[PDB]
């Protein structure tokens, strides 16, 4: 954009009106009484939704100052999605309140940086106060309740999520799958299941779908790319002595190898399992080692010195049971020592700290769980794809919120903890008047998310915020019933991490943005 200079209030009020539009575009979507917002995209399908991050990504305004402030506040929403992904509307409304009131104060001409320092002190005090006020969330029924809260009173999804989490255990992975019909379905895969199939239909067993079911087989490890090499026959020689069914982990099986294997099977000579590689070099580096550990076997390689020619039938490990079909194959379990399993966990702990972080630590955890725990697949029951968008958004939000809440605990929803701690932290003071005023304005503005929740209910925000302050402890307000009661015992519990991250991000960005004195803009 072009460079043009503007000064003081010329940008300031723009900032104001800028945030003013963005927030009230978003704030109206909260609550069952509230509706969704329509995001315009002719190149796409304009989306009517409550997805805060989707709205934030969709933000772009005609006005120059409003547009730059909007891309500024989009960054905090993006960072929150990177951190939590839900409660984003709360972060936006609290950030709007604090920035607007800080600008209101600066309109009186106080030092912005001292105000920021006082607010930062208040933020740190609030962080340790949240540490004090955090309530651990351990029991699975409370986990289901908070997931349902994230699902906004979707009881079946909440109970299914609780079932999945209990079945996978502490470190078992949970995965979401695109639902098709109107029926919610939860499936648990035990062991390792990959998408690989035998090309020769002559391998089809008696049961339908081409499923071969085989228990107590022979774990085989091949590190070199073997496709149809006639030098394998010595290994077959051991199998020739064995006369037993077995599974082969090889790159692929080409003409001669498939021919001899098929004729052996159909003539009844020997039955063998051998399938195309699920993953490439990087994945097989993990798979051979982890299969050896889970099956209690020793890794078999063709490089370095060790090769196929020297081998033992007992050098081939064993499994529990394997099932094969057209393109999918599962192995239920194998007998391997826990000592090796946690040795691999310890060596992969160093892999956890990686330069990629996202997109790969997920695969690490999936691998660890499929070696140790089970894999959860959900197809949520729903009619159309546009609403399954919101369904899966709610699902992932509930999952991640549970990830935070299980370890870090929960606190009452609606921000009531923020108002209660603002009541707690009256006596905190700064160096001078500026820092004290910053603390005061932060504590005054931090009640805004709750008042906006009340407004979404179409009720008096001041009265509710003036009464709740009268109340304490677990007492609060229910929007579904639209009346007071026990805030906590009813079950609106949210991980404290989302609150911490929201307040911290909002404070960090607000302190730097409130201090602006001159600004640049594009040509008309």
């Amino acid at each position: 954009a072009a460079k043009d200079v503007k000064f003081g209030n010329d940008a300031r009020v723009k900032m104001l009106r800028g945030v003013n539009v963005l927030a009230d575009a978003v704030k109206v979507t909260l609550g069952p009484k509230g509706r969704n917002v329509v995001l315009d995209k002719s190149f796409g399908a304009p989306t009517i939704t409550k997805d805060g991050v989707s709205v934030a990504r969709e933000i772009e305004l005609e006005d120059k100052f409003e547009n730059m402030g909007a891309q500024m506040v989009k960054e905090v929403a993006s960072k929150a999605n990177d951190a939590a992904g839900d409660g984003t509307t709360t972060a936006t409304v609290l950030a709007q309140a604090i920035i607007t009131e800080g600008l209101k104060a600066v309109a009186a001409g106080m030092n912005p940086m001292d105000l920021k320092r006082g607010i930062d002190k208040a933020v740190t005090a609030a962080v340790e106060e949240l540490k004090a006020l955090s309530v651990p969330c351990s029991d699975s029924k409370a986990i289901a309740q908070v997931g349902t809260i994230s699902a906004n009173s979707d009881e079946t999804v909440g109970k299914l999520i609780a079932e999945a989490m209990d079945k996978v255990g502490k470190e078992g992975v949970i995965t979401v799958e695109d639902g098709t019909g109107l029926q919610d379905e939860l499936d648990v895969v035990e062991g390792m299941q990959f998408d690989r199939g035998y090309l020769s239909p002559y391998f089809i067993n008696k049961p339908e779908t081409g499923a071969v079911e085989l228990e107590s087989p022979f774990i085989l490890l091949a590190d070199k790319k073997i496709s149809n090499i006639r030098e394998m026959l010595p290994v077959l020689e051991a199998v020739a002595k064995a006369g037993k069914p077995l599974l082969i982990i090889a790159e692929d099986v080409e003409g001669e190898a498939l021919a001899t294997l098929v004729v052996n099977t159909m003539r009844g000579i020997v039955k063998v399992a051998a399938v195309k590689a699920p993953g490439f070099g990087d994945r097989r580096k993990a798979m051979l080692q982890d299969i050896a550990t889970l099956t209690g076997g020793t890794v078999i390689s063709e490089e370095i010195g060790m090769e196929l020619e020297k081998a033992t039938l007992e050098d081939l490990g064993q499994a529990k049971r394997v099932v094969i079909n057209k393109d999918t194959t599962t192995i239920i379990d194998g007998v391997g020592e826990e000592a090796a399993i946690q040795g691999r966990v310890a060596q992969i702990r160093q892999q956890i700290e990686e330069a990629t972080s996202d997109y790969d630590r997920e695969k690490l955890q999936e691998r660890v769980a499929k070696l140790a725990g089970g894999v959860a697949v959900i197809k949520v029951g729903a009619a159309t794809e546009v609403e399954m968008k919101e369904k899966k958004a709610r699902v992932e939000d509930a999952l991640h919120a549970t990830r935070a809440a299980v370890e870090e605990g929960v606190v009452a929803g609606g921000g009531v903890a923020l108002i209660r701690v603002a009541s707690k932290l009256a006596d905190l003071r700064g160096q001078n008047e500026d820092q004290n005023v910053g603390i005061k304005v932060a504590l005054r503005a931090m009640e805004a998310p709750l008042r906006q929740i009340v407004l979404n209910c179409g009720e008096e925000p001041s009265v509710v915020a003036n009464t709740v302050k009268g109340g304490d402890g677990n007492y609060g307000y229910n929007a579904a019933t639209e009346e007071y009661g026990n805030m906590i015992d009813m079950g609106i519990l949210d991980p404290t991490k989302v609150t911490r991250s929201a307040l911290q991000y909002a404070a960090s960005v607000a302190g730097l943005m409130i201090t602006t004195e001159c600004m640049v803009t594009d040509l008309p």
């Binding site: 190149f43 796409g44 399908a45 993006s78 979401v176 695109d178 993953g279 490439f280 070099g281 990087d282 994945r283 580096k285 997109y359 695969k363 794809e385 546009v386």
Partner: protein, 459 residues
């Protein structure tokens, strides 16, 4: 969902060569130091690919590779090798073709806006010799069209011409025909390319096509028409009736008779009728470069050299790749590494060479100055592209002189059938060092050819 977990390629290009059916189409995800992470993927394929009303699917259905299925190998320098797969798409019994919306969604990576263009020189990753399986396969240029008349493939002749003074204007045939009447280098003249019956055209738009009615001096005169008489019409629906079967006397020489290739409105549209018979409509672009987007003052263009990998059908004599990137601020591992890659004395490699299972003419354009006196220079890799050594006419102010050298579409024949190393590219002549008296804008800072122009009393 997600995007990945479908291709876990963990080996270098060697594995990408063994497969043979691997076609690469994607954008390099090298986040620029200075541009931070989020924008690298935000503007990669989220808003510049298709528009994507909801989402689309092919008739085969259940395609797992809508997003960038990145197998990029990253251990040393983040060497990016990413492909939009095409071989895994809908395979049919007889044609193997997909539906209307299949390719329209994923295969046209568009770098329309993102800052990834400051310096990005992409050297060699090319579709191997295993390309004729279920593909047409172009390997023909004007050096292979009239090949039976004396042009072999690689640097073996051409039809692109050099012009003697005057540069252009006052068309040669009436009076300046003596410039074209010299078979010694005046053999195929072309005019400036930004012309034709374009919407933004001057009063000369009528003249261009009018050049057709003056083809009366090719049969009874004793000379064959080899000028780029810009008569290639825009509206095609006139040739349909008669010329189909016998009256094709115009000939396949799309680079002897004119052809309009401006780079915006023509491209290679001829694919439809001539899938197999005449896939060779020559890339007929007048030799203009280093004046449109390369200049930091005037940057008007984009980067598509990766996606141009299918374009070898045209027989390119010109492509707007960019520049070597010399000037501005050096140091911090100075950008002179162009020399440091091979000219360094204490380097060594005993085992492998440049063999990507299907080599072809591949040599970067001589920009700035590269004379045969600097024989330790540019002749290492291949030394020649589908072009002929032709630079500014600084020392070229004579009628015949070294008659052999000026043979633009004839001395290449001898200079490639002589069979004397990579010197063949510059076997012609070496006095080109004087040509800097004419064209300044190639050697500006490092070469001492500009020292006489300005810079206080020194030489």
């Amino acid at each position: 969902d997600q995007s990945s977990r479908y291709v876990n390629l963990a080996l270098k290009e060697e594995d990408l060569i063994a497969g043979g059916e691997h076609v690469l189409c994607a954008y390099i995800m090298k986040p620029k130091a200075g541009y931070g992470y989020v924008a690298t993927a935000a503007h990669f394929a989220a808003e510049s690919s298709t528009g994507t009303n909801v989402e689309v699917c092919t008739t085969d259905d259940f395609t797992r590779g809508v997003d960038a299925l990145v197998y990029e190998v990253d251990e040393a320098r983040e060497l990016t090798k990413i492909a939009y797969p095409v071989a895994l798409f809908d395979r049919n019994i007889t044609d193997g073709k997909a539906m209307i919306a299949s390719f329209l969604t994923l295969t046209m990576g568009n770098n329309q806006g993102m800052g990834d263009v400051e310096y990005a020189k992409m050297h060699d990753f090319y579709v191997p010799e295993a390309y004729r399986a279920l593909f047409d396969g172009p390997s023909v240029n004007i050096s292979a069209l009239w090949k039976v008349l004396g042009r072999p493939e690689v640097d073996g002749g051409l039809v692109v011409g050099t012009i003697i003074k005057p540069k252009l204007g006052l068309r040669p045939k009436p009076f300046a025909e003596a410039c074209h009447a010299f078979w010694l280098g005046g053999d195929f003249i072309k005019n400036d390319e930004p012309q034709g019956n374009q919407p933004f055209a001057p009063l000369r738009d009528t003249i261009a096509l009018v050049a057709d009615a003056m083809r009366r001096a090719q049969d009874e005169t004793g000379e064959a028409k080899l000028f780029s008489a810009n008569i290639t019409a825009d509206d095609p629906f006139e040739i349909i009736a008669r010329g189909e079967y016998v009256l094709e006397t115009f000939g396949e020489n799309a680079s002897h008779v004119a052809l309009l290739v401006d780079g915006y409105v023509a491209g290679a549209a001829a694919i439809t009728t001539a899938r197999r018979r005449f896939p060779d409509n020559f890339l007929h672009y007048h030799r203009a470069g280093h004046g449109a987007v390369t200049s930091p003052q005037s940057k008007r263009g984009y980067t598509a050299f990766v996606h141009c990998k299918m374009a070898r059908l045209q027989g390119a004599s010109g492509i707007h790749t960019g520049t070597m990137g010399f000037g501005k601020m050096e140091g911090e591992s100075s950008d002179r590494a162009i020399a440091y890659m091979l000219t360094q004395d204490e380097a060594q490699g005993p085992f492998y060479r440049q063999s990507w299972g299907g080599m072809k003419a591949c040599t970067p354009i001589i920009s700035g100055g590269m004379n045969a006196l600097r024989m330790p220079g540019f002749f290492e890799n291949l030394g020649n592209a589908n072009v002929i050594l032709t630079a500014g006419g600084g020392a070229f102010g004579h009628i015949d002189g070294p008659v052999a050298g000026a043979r633009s579409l004839r001395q290449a024949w001898q200079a490639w059938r002589d069979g004397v190393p990579v010197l063949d590219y510059a076997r012609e002549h070496k006095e080109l060092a004087r040509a800097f008296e004419s064209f300044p804008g190639d050697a500006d800072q490092i070469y001492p050819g500009w020292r006489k122009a300005l810079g206080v009393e020194d030489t």
